[PDB]
Structure 1
Amino acid sequence: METIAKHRHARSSAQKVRLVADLIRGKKVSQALDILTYTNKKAAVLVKKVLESAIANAEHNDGADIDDLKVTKIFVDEGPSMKRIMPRAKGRADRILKRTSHITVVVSDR
């Protein structure tokens, strides 16, 4: 029916990745791949690798034809944050959150 790929614990805030996921939600995969190729965002590289993996999964594991595939579902979830310390002035310390995301792409011919 549908085929999935994910990139869990990707190094980017979900807010940043969602800007890219929104460009391709619902598109034919060939058009999605073109959009990502010409999107100048680091998140576009991340998402394009997940989409390519989902297309390979669909053809190898599920016997799908790539020309019929669409990005039927795509969403980004918040992963764990890495906590770091940033020295500020006057002996004060701040917490830094290095946020991560789980990227999920679903492709299907229906």
Structure 2
Amino acid sequence: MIAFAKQFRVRISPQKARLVCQLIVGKKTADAQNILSNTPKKAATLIAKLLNSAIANATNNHGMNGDALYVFECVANQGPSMKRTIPRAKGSSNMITKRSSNLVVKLSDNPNERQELIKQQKALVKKRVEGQQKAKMAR
């Protein structure tokens, strides 16, 4: 159950995006769409459109319930920001940065879909332990 929706480089600081989206992580979309359409934040429309596209993809492209989906995790990645020079007093200058962001949010259907990650990590370390065991099995 991935239901992700990547964004790839809208110009906004992810520092504020994380801060605004703790309030929606782990909760459904019906109670979140109204509040995001009403919250006074710049990234509100962005995240609302992203989650709408994610829901549309989940229902159409894959096909799931919808009544039990909720935000699995926040992440607002730090891609290449852009550097510009600004002049100041006494013929001095500073070299300021303008931030961009990658936005991708997964949607989960059950109270689960976390533990199997640990299960498969344990599996890939097990296949290592049998691999190591077979090393000494040479005769």
State if a TM-score over 0.5 links the two structures: yes
Deviation at residue 109 of structure 1 after TM alignment:
1.2
More relative contact order, 1 or 2 (CA 8 Å, 6+ apart):
1
2:55 is the counterpart of 1:55? yes
Runs of 4+ with >2 A deviation: none
Counterpart of 2:72 in structure 1 is 72
The count of residues paired between Structure 1 and Structure 2 equals 110
Counterpart of 2:9 in structure 1 is 9
Q: Is the 8 A contact 1:23 1:35 kept in 2?
A: no
| SS class of match (1:94) | strand
C-alpha offsets along residues 40-70 of structure 1, whole Å, 9 cap, x if unaligned? Answer: 0001111111111111110111111222211
CA–CA distance in structure 2, aligned partners of residues 70 and 40 of structure 1: 22
Whichever of the two has the greater Rg, that structure is 2
**For structure 2, which runs of at least 5 residues remain unmatched after alignment?**
111-139
Deviation at residue 74 of structure 1 after TM alignment:
2.0
Q: Is the 8 A contact 2:18 2:74 kept in 1?
A: no
TM-score calculated relative to the size of structure 2: 0.74
TM-score calculated relative to the size of structure 1: 0.92
Q: Is the 8 A contact 2:26 2:72 kept in 1?
A: yes
CA–CA distance in structure 2, aligned partners of residues 52 and 20 of structure 1: 18
Q: Is the 8 A contact 1:3 1:57 kept in 2?
A: yes
2:22 is the counterpart of 1:45? no
Counterpart of 1:103 in structure 2 is 103
Identity of aligned residues (%): 50
